[PDB]
Amino acid sequence: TTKRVKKMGKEEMKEMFDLVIYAFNQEPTAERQERFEKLLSHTQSYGFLIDEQLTSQVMATPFQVNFHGVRYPMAGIGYVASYPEYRGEGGISAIMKEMLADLAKQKVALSYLAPFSYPFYRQYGYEQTFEQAEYTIKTEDWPRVKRVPGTIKRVSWADGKEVIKDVYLENQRAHSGGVIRETWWLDYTLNRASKPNNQAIYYSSEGKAEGYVIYRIAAGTFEIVEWNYLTNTAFKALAGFIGSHSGSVQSFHWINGFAGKDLNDLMPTPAASVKILPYMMARIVELQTFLEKYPFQSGEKETYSLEIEDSYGPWNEGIWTITIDEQGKATVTKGAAALKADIQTWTQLFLGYRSAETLSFYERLQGDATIAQRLGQRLVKGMPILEDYF
Amino acid sequence: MTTKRVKKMGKEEMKEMFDLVIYAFNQEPTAERQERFEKLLSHTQSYGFLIDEQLTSQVMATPFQVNFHGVRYPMAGIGYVASYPEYRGEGGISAIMKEMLADLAKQKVALSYLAPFSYPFYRQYGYEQTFEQAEYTIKTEDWPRVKRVPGTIKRVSWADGKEVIKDVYLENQRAHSGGVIRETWWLDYTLNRASKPNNQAIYYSSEGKAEGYVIYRIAAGTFEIVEWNYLTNTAFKALAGFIGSHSGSVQSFHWINGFAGKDLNDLMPTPAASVKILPYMMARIVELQTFLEKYPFQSGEKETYSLEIEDSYGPWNEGIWTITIDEQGKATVTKGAAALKADIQTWTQLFLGYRSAETLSFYERLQGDATIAQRLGQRLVKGMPILEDYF
Amino acid sequence: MTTKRVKKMGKEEMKEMFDLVIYAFNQEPTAERQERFEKLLSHTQSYGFLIDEQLTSQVMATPFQVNFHGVRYPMAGIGYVASYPEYRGEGGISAIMKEMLADLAKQKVALSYLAPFSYPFYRQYGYEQTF
């Protein structure tokens, strides 16, 4: 009988943890329960009740993203779950409808998620905007690196977590739509007794932290869990530190954000096997907030007319005038050189995942290709990079 | 003791060259394969190393032209590098490389490409990886359904299709970042071989213009896309639905093409292709001055850079060059003044667009002020180079 | 600048050594594993290399007797040769192997055996494959 979408608090914790344990098939240990309580305390959960029974659920975690120097509010969507006996009741679609409306009411500008199925979330406005590079190299193929100035210390999480956070945020890879990571979020993702990592930090000869590796050895593989460096001599120092484990390992493995150029050619022999994995999908949530802050390249005052289609974001739908002044600043205005595209294509275009020239060729960005080209020269250059999972 | 010498080889040495190439690459001497060797030899300059007048090592340089962002450069494609095992350490390949690079520089060859069995082995002569390949493998059930679109597709014989396949290839954007300006004999040499036969189909638009082709074969349950080029989105969808029609007779589809920084997997509703990035050919600038005087720099304001080049096997490229890039593309290039310093490997990656000024500056291969490196990077060509030919 | 020295080790150095052996050989540090290492340590001569007074490398020699065609020979069985990965070419195992082979000859040991990770590596200190 009665169906309704409900905002969930920590009074509904046990209903939601039982849905997430079922949907994701995870053993409900005391550690996994307190990580879920920690995440619940930072997230907005939306539930779908049929006759007051929670049958589906979507969580929206609030993040800040660094997009080429601009702070954007970002909703990280995760734990999409529903019980199997409620097929066809329209639960996710009802949650997504209120949730997106809610996040717009809050002026959230962007939203990311890791899809079990791409078409399933593309129906709600999302589109692939992120890719990952998977490197695998045999232990005999890890290259020999000469020793270099500076020092590396292996480090407790307690003692290394604050230096690891600052090195990460200062890194230029963290500046293309990456998460601006909070202390709580870093502890939640990288400090798990169920699956423990080691950590080592590079310090310059002058004493400054210029890099770090987080790593584990499991099942004969050296897992490079994360590897960040701010200078070339931090890169070479840590590459030799990793390489030193080669005797206890049959291969090295690393998955990180792909932005169009892989690292295989930095070796004398390009011996890494390299795969490109589809990664998260994204969508512009509140389009006016997104374009008002957007860091356009500086140039001549230009004005554009954009038509948006967005069936789950009606507040984005219709024709906009955007005038981009000689600096990075745009004024955005509803009402009306027309260009036309769905919220999926505009999101790939503005986050920099595909170029206006390409999106014009494959006819997803409709309009005079020469006008698509002038707009493309005002946009951010280079693909967006995401090195966080949720 | 023994007479050692590098000789420029000709038709009269063909049999001694063929015997050495049959040994070094372990191929059986089919009369068909000697025919193909004679055809290549007549289009190539071979340099041999003779010890007491016996041919012991060889390198071949096939003269190609290359379309680099609108600019046509003479390129020497290097292949059939072969030495007999008894003459290890006698210095033959190195002796050939030194005389041959010098001769190719006399001819004002701008660029040289090769496919290496070993990257370190060719790096010592100034070559560096500057090309990559994307390998796609998709299961037959995962090939997407594509609605029928306007225009027609005809399956064609090689004789009826070769000159249209050449025009659509040369017209296609992906042929404009360092790719071979393919001559008719080279297209026949690579894409019409008795021993590895292909099918071909051309897409004509609704007004009759050839706007795409696929060259393909089916072997051991895999549909092999040997080559697929398209000038319009409607050509791309028509040919994609044509490759898709064979899905009921095949267990997977497989495609290796040149990689330029972005794979095609997202052009499907389900990005179900397995995508692997493969190391591909190496390249070097041969005659630096010819190369930079023709280079299509971005327009902007006049700037001058002094550049220092290390280049052991290209000593005519070495030293400090002053380069002044005017408000249009044009550079004037002078020797003997540096803000930026690199070895010819890094300058080749930089100027062909393989890596950025920023990246090569960060990893300390391009040395000098990072801000000067930044500004020279702004005058350079955009996007990675693409090669879709093998030799 | 950096201080470096070979030091003979003992019971007081136990956990510094156990933590190096757990890291280098990637084993879980259970109570059983620690008791057995405490047992082996009490029958072994152990050498360490300190750099700025931190243990960085380590070699153990267990005194065995060997039956060689009727003759008893004292043999030093070398094992748990371990280095932390922050240090490389600080000369640590080479400095240890020099002091330790000299100490073993002073004690009149006739033979040493070890399970090599690299044959070229221990062949530089005189060892050869014999088994």
Side-chain angles (χ1 to χ4, degrees):
Chain A
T1 294
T2 68
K3 305 172 158 213
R4 51 182 270 249
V5 175
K6 174 195 166 186
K7 273 181 154 185
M8 312 278 283
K10 309 176 214 184
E11 309 86 338
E12 289 73 56
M13 193 270 172
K14 202 254 184 181
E15 297 90 284
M16 297 178 271
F17 186 50
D18 292 342
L19 176 46
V20 169
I21 286 159
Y22 188 90
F24 291 87
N25 193 60
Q26 33 182 44
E27 35 173 312
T29 71
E31 179 184 338
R32 193 171 323 253
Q33 189 185 327
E34 286 218 297
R35 283 183 78 248
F36 187 79
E37 291 184 47
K38 229 303 157 179
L39 181 74
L40 219 205
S41 74
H42 291 270
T43 295
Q44 184 64 103
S45 190
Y46 292 83
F48 194 68
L49 307 193
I50 299 181
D51 282 292
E52 296 309 289
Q53 302 304 123
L54 172 74
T55 68
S56 296
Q57 165 215 114
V58 173
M59 285 176 150
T61 302
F63 289 104
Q64 291 290 306
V65 117
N66 180 359
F67 189 71
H68 302 273
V70 173
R71 263 109 214 85
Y72 277 120
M74 185 265 295
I77 288 175
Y79 285 134
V80 181
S82 62
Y83 285 129
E85 346 88 19
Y86 301 108
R87 312 197 284 125
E89 304 302 296
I92 307 95
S93 310
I95 290 161
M96 295 296 292
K97 195 190 165 186
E98 166 164 321
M99 187 187 78
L100 285 167
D102 215 283
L103 297 166
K105 185 181 182 165
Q106 290 162 220
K107 307 312 181 82
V108 171
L110 290 169
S111 176
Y112 304 163
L113 64 70
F116 72 93
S117 149
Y118 282 78
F120 181 84
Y121 295 104
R122 179 175 306 112
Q123 68 180 326
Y124 304 124
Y126 289 78
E127 192 56 79
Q128 191 179 159
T129 61
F130 290 108
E131 266 160 21
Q132 284 185 316
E134 180 174 14
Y135 299 90
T136 305
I137 185 163
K138 295 177 186 172
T139 188
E140 333 87 61
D141 283 325
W142 189 273
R144 298 176 54 274
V145 190
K146 295 211 286 163
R147 291 157 66 249
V148 109
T151 54
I152 297 174
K153 247 152 147 151
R154 296 174 289 97
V155 120
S156 74
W157 181 255
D159 290 345
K161 62 149 91 180
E162 339 69 7
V163 174
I164 288 160
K165 193 179 86 198
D166 293 333
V167 160
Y168 168 75
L169 293 167
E170 180 167 346
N171 182 7
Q172 310 138 203
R173 310 247 308 151
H175 301 165
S176 292
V179 180
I180 294 179
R181 292 179 182 173
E182 282 177 279
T183 309
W184 86 265
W185 173 254
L186 212 53
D187 281 35
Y188 174 91
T189 56
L190 294 155
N191 196 40
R192 292 218 215 157
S194 84
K195 196 176 155 213
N197 308 312
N198 287 21
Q199 303 81 214
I201 298 171
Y202 174 75
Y203 290 99
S204 66
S205 60
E206 311 298 309
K208 209 213 114 166
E210 309 196 318
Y212 67 87
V213 228
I214 308 173
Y215 63 97
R216 29 193 289 108
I217 296 181
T221 297
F222 189 98
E223 298 293 344
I224 297 175
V225 181
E226 193 156 293
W227 183 12
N228 281 315
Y229 43 86
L230 304 167
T231 70
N232 185 55
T233 130
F235 175 67
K236 281 143 106 151
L238 290 160
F241 176 87
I242 290 161
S244 293
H245 301 252
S246 69
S248 65
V249 125
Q250 308 314 311
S251 68
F252 295 84
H253 179 241
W254 184 22
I255 304 181
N256 75 344
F258 182 64
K261 189 75 216 52
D262 64 293
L263 274 14
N264 210 5
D265 62 296
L266 305 186
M267 294 178 272
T269 305
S273 148
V274 186
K275 304 162 198 162
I276 304 166
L277 313 175
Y279 196 39
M280 299 220 186
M281 299 175 95
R283 61 157 297 155
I284 293 153
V285 177
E286 218 300 283
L287 175 68
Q288 210 177 218
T289 313
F290 181 72
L291 290 160
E292 285 179 313
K293 289 182 87 158
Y294 191 89
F296 295 100
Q297 305 287 342
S298 43
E300 295 196 54
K301 167 166 178 168
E302 290 162 19
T303 274
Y304 294 91
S305 188
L306 312 185
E307 183 155 58
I308 285 103
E309 301 104 51
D310 191 2
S311 77
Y312 278 79
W315 57 85
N316 294 323
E317 291 202 281
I319 302 186
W320 304 80
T321 302
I322 183 190
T323 95
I324 313 169
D325 82 5
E326 299 103 305
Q327 289 70 247
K329 180 156 207 215
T331 77
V332 179
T333 347
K334 203 157 184 171
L339 255 24
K340 181 181 173 183
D342 61 349
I343 195 55
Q344 292 88 342
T345 291
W346 289 118
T347 305
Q348 288 181 320
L349 181 86
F350 285 116
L351 296 187
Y353 178 69
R354 319 273 310 187
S355 65
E357 301 73 28
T358 281
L359 297 170
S360 183
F361 180 93
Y362 290 105
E363 290 175 1
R364 311 203 176 166
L365 181 51
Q366 301 157 27
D368 188 344
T370 207
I371 301 274
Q373 288 210 138
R374 308 154 150 184
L375 182 51
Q377 271 134 220
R378 301 308 298 281
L379 295 202
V380 138
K381 286 297 164 308
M383 289 164 63
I385 302 171
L386 185 62
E387 310 212 280
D388 279 277
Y389 180 74
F390 43 76
Chain B
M1 179 37 260
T2 47
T3 128
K4 299 181 166 194
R5 64 185 269 251
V6 172
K7 183 204 207 176
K8 293 184 89 171
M9 310 281 278
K11 207 204 202 306
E12 213 158 34
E13 289 85 37
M14 182 274 154
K15 208 267 187 153
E16 307 91 83
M17 280 175 276
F18 186 59
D19 290 350
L20 165 56
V21 156
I22 281 301
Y23 185 94
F25 295 82
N26 201 54
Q27 26 198 53
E28 37 142 31
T30 80
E32 191 186 284
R33 199 197 319 274
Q34 197 184 297
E35 255 153 50
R36 290 190 74 239
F37 189 70
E38 293 180 278
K39 165 54 59 176
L40 181 70
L41 207 228
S42 72
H43 283 283
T44 292
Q45 185 51 55
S46 171
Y47 302 72
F49 191 67
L50 322 193
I51 301 182
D52 295 73
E53 303 299 318
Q54 304 302 113
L55 179 69
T56 69
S57 297
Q58 140 224 157
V59 184
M60 285 175 185
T62 308
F64 288 104
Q65 303 274 297
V66 122
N67 185 359
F68 190 71
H69 300 274
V71 174
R72 152 187 276 88
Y73 275 121
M75 182 263 285
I78 305 299
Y80 285 126
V81 172
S83 297
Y84 278 129
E86 327 78 277
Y87 306 100
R88 18 146 9 198
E90 302 281 355
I93 296 307
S94 285
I96 294 163
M97 285 302 303
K98 196 186 203 224
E99 276 192 44
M100 172 187 87
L101 284 162
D103 182 38
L104 292 176
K106 275 150 87 198
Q107 286 160 222
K108 300 281 167 35
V109 173
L111 287 173
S112 175
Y113 298 170
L114 53 76
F117 74 93
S118 160
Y119 283 79
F121 179 89
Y122 292 105
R123 191 168 297 107
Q124 75 183 307
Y125 308 117
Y127 290 86
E128 184 54 72
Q129 195 186 161
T130 65
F131 289 110
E132 276 165 14
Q133 297 188 311
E135 188 182 348
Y136 302 81
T137 308
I138 184 153
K139 297 173 191 79
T140 192
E141 332 84 58
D142 286 340
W143 188 280
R145 305 230 293 158
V146 195
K147 293 180 290 126
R148 274 165 56 206
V149 88
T152 77
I153 304 187
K154 291 154 180 162
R155 287 170 304 107
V156 295
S157 59
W158 186 246
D160 292 2
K162 53 140 107 79
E163 288 298 88
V164 178
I165 287 168
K166 190 164 93 110
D167 296 348
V168 166
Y169 172 80
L170 299 165
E171 195 176 356
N172 123 80
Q173 278 180 243
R174 313 232 319 145
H176 301 161
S177 310
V180 166
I181 298 169
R182 298 181 182 169
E183 303 188 68
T184 294
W185 77 271
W186 177 249
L187 210 77
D188 292 350
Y189 183 75
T190 59
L191 287 176
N192 185 38
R193 343 226 273 89
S195 41
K196 217 176 177 189
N198 291 316
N199 295 318
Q200 307 93 187
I202 304 178
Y203 170 84
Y204 297 91
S205 72
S206 53
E207 36 283 343
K209 189 185 159 171
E211 276 184 5
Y213 60 87
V214 213
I215 301 175
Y216 58 104
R217 39 196 284 110
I218 298 173
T222 291
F223 188 104
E224 299 290 341
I225 302 164
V226 176
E227 183 157 293
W228 181 19
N229 289 307
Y230 45 88
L231 307 182
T232 66
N233 176 45
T234 163
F236 164 70
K237 295 193 296 175
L239 292 158
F242 177 85
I243 289 155
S245 301
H246 307 256
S247 69
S249 27
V250 126
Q251 299 327 297
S252 75
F253 290 85
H254 182 244
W255 188 20
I256 296 165
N257 64 358
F259 182 58
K262 188 72 202 51
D263 71 30
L264 285 20
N265 209 9
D266 64 303
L267 298 185
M268 290 171 279
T270 305
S274 167
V275 181
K276 201 200 187 195
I277 306 324
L278 305 178
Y280 193 38
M281 288 216 189
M282 294 173 103
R284 53 167 299 150
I285 296 144
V286 172
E287 213 289 275
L288 182 61
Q289 182 159 193
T290 310
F291 185 74
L292 288 181
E293 286 169 356
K294 263 189 149 168
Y295 191 98
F297 291 99
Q298 302 306 329
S299 33
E301 311 180 351
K302 171 183 295 328
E303 291 166 345
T304 321
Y305 300 88
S306 55
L307 309 182
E308 188 180 358
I309 290 69
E310 181 186 48
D311 190 350
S312 162
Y313 274 83
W316 54 87
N317 290 323
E318 279 196 316
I320 296 160
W321 298 78
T322 313
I323 178 173
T324 141
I325 297 159
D326 74 21
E327 298 84 345
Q328 276 64 238
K330 290 76 138 185
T332 73
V333 177
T334 304
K335 200 166 185 184
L340 278 17
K341 182 188 174 191
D343 58 13
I344 197 70
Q345 289 91 347
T346 297
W347 286 116
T348 299
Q349 282 181 324
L350 181 70
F351 282 118
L352 296 191
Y354 188 64
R355 321 270 296 174
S356 49
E358 308 86 274
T359 276
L360 290 163
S361 188
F362 180 91
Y363 293 111
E364 291 173 350
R365 310 207 169 171
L366 184 60
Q367 295 147 52
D369 199 336
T371 190
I372 299 328
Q374 256 192 306
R375 273 206 287 85
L376 177 61
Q378 277 149 180
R379 305 306 303 270
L380 293 175
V381 132
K382 295 175 171 54
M384 299 175 59
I386 304 157
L387 181 56
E388 312 216 281
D389 274 279
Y390 182 80
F391 43 79
Chain C
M1 182 37 258
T2 302
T3 66
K4 306 189 191 207
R5 46 183 281 233
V6 173
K7 167 180 175 203
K8 267 164 161 153
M9 311 266 254
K11 272 197 175 178
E12 321 83 29
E13 284 78 59
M14 192 276 160
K15 277 292 271 102
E16 230 193 339
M17 293 181 276
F18 188 59
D19 284 5
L20 172 47
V21 152
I22 287 311
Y23 192 98
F25 297 96
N26 195 42
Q27 15 198 49
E28 79 179 287
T30 69
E32 173 171 302
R33 196 164 302 271
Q34 184 179 315
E35 271 156 351
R36 294 195 31 273
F37 182 77
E38 282 179 273
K39 232 295 165 184
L40 178 66
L41 205 249
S42 70
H43 295 270
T44 305
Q45 285 179 94
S46 317
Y47 297 68
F49 198 71
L50 318 206
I51 297 165
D52 300 303
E53 301 304 280
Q54 323 301 139
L55 182 54
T56 62
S57 278
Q58 182 205 115
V59 177
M60 304 199 158
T62 306
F64 292 113
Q65 208 87 17
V66 135
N67 184 343
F68 184 77
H69 301 270
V71 169
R72 288 207 331 271
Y73 277 123
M75 179 267 294
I78 311 303
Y80 287 101
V81 179
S83 298
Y84 278 126
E86 304 87 275
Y87 309 95
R88 319 163 36 205
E90 306 281 50
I93 282 134
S94 300
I96 287 171
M97 290 293 300
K98 200 190 177 199
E99 150 126 17
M100 189 203 69
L101 280 157
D103 281 8
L104 290 169
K106 277 204 66 156
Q107 292 159 219
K108 304 301 173 34
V109 170
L111 297 162
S112 193
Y113 299 166
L114 52 76
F117 72 92
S118 162
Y119 286 76
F121 185 74
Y122 298 93
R123 178 173 310 107
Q124 80 192 298
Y125 315 117
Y127 288 83
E128 194 50 82
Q129 180 176 171
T130 61
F131 295 102

